[PDB]
C-alpha cells in the first residue's frame with residue numbers, strides 16, 4: 002500500500018526513498034536501475050523493494066469520507 | 071483412546087510400525103523419497119570421502135543413541151579406509167557404521183546380494199556399482215537407491 | 218513419612234520420659250548399626266545412593282532427635298547413651314555419606330550441635346560434599362520427592378491461636394530445647 | 395546457580411566416566427559446532443560430536459569419549475575454557491588492528 | 496607381516512564420471528600373468544599412465560587412533576595407505592586366481608598365479624602404495 | 627593446534643570503515659567461528675526498537691496494528707548500553723522504568739489548506755500535514771532521562787521514512803514504548819541492514835595462457851581481476867579480491883581445462899552494514915564479546931547430574 006519501511010531481506014531502511022525515486026525518474030529522467038543505485042540500493046534484495054513498489058495508497062486516499070466532494 | 075485396552079490395541083495391532091508390508095501383495099509401503107534418494111546416490115558414490123571429523127558427525131547426527139536403541143551405550147566406529155597419507159572414510163562406511171550401531175550386537179551382520187536402478191556403464195569402465203553387496207553387515211560395493 | 222513423624226514426635230512431645238526417648242534412640246542406632254554392617258558393601262556395587270533412601274530417612278530422624286534432646290543423652294557420668302559420640306562419626310564417615318543426602322538444614326544443625334558436644338565432626342565432610350558439587354549419584358526425577366518428604370515435619374509449631382495455647386503443656390518450642 | 399541448563403544423560407554415560415552425553419538447553423549449532431571443534435583438539439578425546447534432536451525443541455546434545463587419561467567431564471571443561479581463551483585471542487587481535495588502522 | 500608386493504606399471508587411469516577417484520589398470524613388471532585394477536583417491540595420490548607403483552598388501556603394520564608423539568609403523572615407508580576387506584576369491588583358470596578387495600567402496604581386483612598370491616586370505620588387509 | 631599458534635596466524639584486514647558500513651577480512655580463522663560472529667551480529671546483538679504502541683486515536687486510512695508495525699521497524703538512534711532490560715514478570719506499572727524504556731509520542735491532525743495554488747496536485751500545498759514522517763516521533767524523556775539523554779535526544783536514524791498519509795479531518799495520536807530486544811526474537815531488533823561474509827576468491831591457472839587466449843580468458847572475469855603481462859604475454863591474476871565468482875570461465879570449453887576456482891579457504895570477507903544505532907565495528911565487537919560470554923557463562927555453570 003504505502004512504501005515499506007525496511008527491505009524484507011536486508012533490514013535496510015527503504016521508506017525514505019520512495020518520494021525521491023519518483024523525482025529521479027520524473028525530473029532527472031534516469032532509468033530505473035540508475036536511480037536505484039543513486040539512492041544506495043545495492044543488493045538486489047533492496048533494489049526490488051523500490052523498483053516494484055505499487056503506491057496503491059494514493060488510490061485509497063481518493064475516497065475520503067470526511068470531506069464534501 | 072480412553073482406556074488401557076484401547077491403548078494396548080493401538081500400540082500393538084493398529085500401530086504403524088508392523089505395517090511395513092501391505093496385505094494386498096506383501097510388499098513394502100514405507101520408504102524414503104525425493105531428497106533422500108538423490109542424497110543416497112551421492113553419499114554412497116565411490117567419489118565420496120569424509121575426514122574423521124565429518125564421519126563422526128554424520129554418525130551422531132543420525133543415530134540418536136540417547137534412545138531405546140541402546141544396542142550399546144557407546145557409539146562404535148570403523149577404522150578409516152585410507153590410512154595414509156590422510157585418514158579418510160567412505161560413504162559406504164557411513165552406512166555400515168549406521169547398521170552396526172542399530173542392529174543387535176549378539177547377532178551377525180546382514181548378508182545381501184542385490185541390484186540398484188543404475189547401470190554400471192553410467193559410472194565408467196569396469197564399474198560394478200550396480201551390484202549391491204552387503205557382507206557381514208558392511209556395504210562393500212554398490213550405491214543405495216530407490217530400490 | 219513415618220520416620221519424619223517419629224523424629225518430629227520424640228523432639229516435640231513434652232510429656233515424654235527420658236527412657237521412652239532413649240528407647241527410640243536405642244532402636245534407631247541399633248537398626249542403623251545393622252544397616253551399615255550388612256549393607257555398606259552394596260554401595261560400590263551397581264545401583265545408586267537412592268537404594269538407601271530408608272537409611273538416610275532413619276539417620277535423619279535420629280539426628281533430628283539429637284538436635285532437640287541432646288542434653289538428655291548424657292548420663293550421670295557425662296558419658297553418652299548409645300555411644301552417640303562414637304556412633305555418629307561412624308555413619309558420617311560411612312560410604313552412605315548421610316550428610317550429603319539428608320535434609321540440608323538438619324544436617325547443618327546436627328553438625329553445629331554435634332561439633333559443640335564433641336560428639337562428631339562433620340564440617341569437613343560437608344565442605345568436601347558441596348565442593349564435589351560445584352566441580353554417589355541419584356536421578357532427581359525421584360530425588361526431589363525425597364528432599365520434599367525430608368523437609369516436612371508434622372509437629373513443627375502450630376499457628377492456630379487457641380490450639381497453640383492448649384498445646385503448650387504438651388510442646389517443646391525450639392527456644393526451649 | 396542454574397541447574398536447568400546442562401544435564402548428564404546417564405543412560406549413555408559409562409561407569410568410568412570416560413564417556414558421556416550432555417543435554418544443553420537454549421543452544422543450537424552456534425555453540426555446538428564451535429565447542430566440538432575445540433574439544434576435538436584435545437588429544438585425549440577419542441570421540442566427539444554434537445546433534446540437535448529437533449529444530450523445535452531448544453536442545454543440544456554433546457557426546458564426549460576419552461582415551462582414559464581424563465574423564466568426559468574434564469574434556470567438556472577444557473573445551474569450554476579453550477573456547478573462551480580462543481575468543482579473547484580474537485578480540486585482542488581485532489582491537490589491535492582497529493587501533494593500528 | 497607382509498602378504499604381497501610387486502612393482503606395477505600403469506596402463507590406464509580412468510576418472511570415470513567422478514572427480515576425486517580414478518580407476519587404474521596396471522600390470523606387473525615381474526610376472527607376465529599378474530595384473531591389477533584399483534580405485535584410487537587421485538586427489539590425494541595423483542597417478543598418470545606409465546607411472547610405476549610399488550604395491551604392497553599386508554595383514555598388519557609393525558585399533559586406529561590419530562597419530563601421536565613418535566608413532567612408527569609400516570605406513571611410514573609408503574605414500575598412500577588404505578584399509579579394506581577381501582570379499583571374493585575366484586578361479587580364473589587352472590593356473591590363475593583373482594582376489595577382490597573393497598576399501599570402503601574403492602575396489603581392487605588382483606589377478607595372478609596361484610603360488611604368487613598364496614598368502615592372501617579372505618580377511619581384512621592394508622594396502623600400501625609408493626611411487 | 628594451540629591458542630598461541632592461532633594468535634600468531636590470525637590476521638585482520640580493514641578494507642573500508644565508515645559510520646554505516648564496514649568491509650574487512652578475517653584471515654586464518656575457522657568457518658565455525660566466522661559463522662558464529664555472523665549469526666550473532668544478525669540475531670543476538672541488542673538494539674532499541676518500539677515494542678508497545680498505545681493508540682488514543684487513529685482515523686487514518688492505515689490500520690492501527692499496521693501503523694504500530696512500521697513504527698517498530700523504525701531504527702532508533704539510541705545507544706543500547708544506555709538502557710537496562712525489562713523484566714517481563716512484573717505487572718505493567720512496575721515493568722516500565724527510566725532505565726527500561728523510551729517513550730515516543732506522535733500527534734498529527736490533517737486540515738485542508740485554503741492558500742492552495744488553484745489546480746494543484748501536490749499534497750504539501752493542498753493539505754497541511756498530509757505526510758507523516760519518522761522524524762515526527764517526538765522524544766518524551768521520563769524521570770532521570772531528562773538528564774541522561776540531554777546530550778543525545780532520541781531521533782530515528784532515518785528521519786525521512788514515510789510513516790503514514792492523511793487527508794483533511796483525520797488524526798493520529800499514539801505513544802510508543804521502546805525497549806531492548808534481539809533480532810532472534812524479532813527482526814526489528816536486528817542492528818544490521820545486514821552482516822554477511824564470502825570466502826575469498828582463489829583463481830589459479832593450471833598452465834600459461836597467452837596471446838588471443840589471454841585476452842579471451844581475461845574477459846571471463848570482471849575488469850581488473852585478470853591481468854595480461856607485457857613480455858611473457860601470459861595471463862596472471864591481478865586481484866582476486868574484485869572477483870564475483872560468476873564461474874563464467876567454466877562455460878567456454880577451451881578454458882574449463884586450464885583453471886581451477888577456489889578460495890583462500892577460511893579467509894572471510896565480511897561486510898557489515900548498520901541499521902543506524904551503532905557503528906559496524908561496535909556491532910562486530912559486541913558479537914565477538916557475546917560469543918566469549920556464552921563460553922564463560924557456561925564454564926561457570928554447575929553441571930547437574
Ligand SMILES: [Zn+2]
Pocket residue numbers: 008009010011013044045046047048049050
Ligand atoms: Zn533490499
